[PDB]
């Protein structure tokens, strides 16, 4: 079946605080975890985009 979408502590608290969408954020970490470095360089991108 599904494990449903994971989202570890680090990342769920920064993308709380960053105020970005985990589950767009599709996790790759153990178990479909979204991990911090998945938020961090998601999150950063969407900034990062200026045109």
């Keep these: ?4 979408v ?3 502590p680090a990342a ?8 970005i969408d985990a589950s767009k954020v ?3 970490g153990p178990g479909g ?5 998945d938020v961090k360089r ?3 991108e ?3 985009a200026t045109a």
């Design 1 to 4: 079946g599904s494990r449903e």
């Design 6 to 8: 994971a989202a570890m």
């Design 12 to 19: 769920r608290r920064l993308a709380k605080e960053l105020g």
């Design 26 to 28: 599709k996790g790759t």
């Design 33 to 37: 975890v979204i991990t911090v470095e």
């Design 42 to 44: 998601w999150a950063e």
């Design 46 to 48: 969407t900034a990062k």
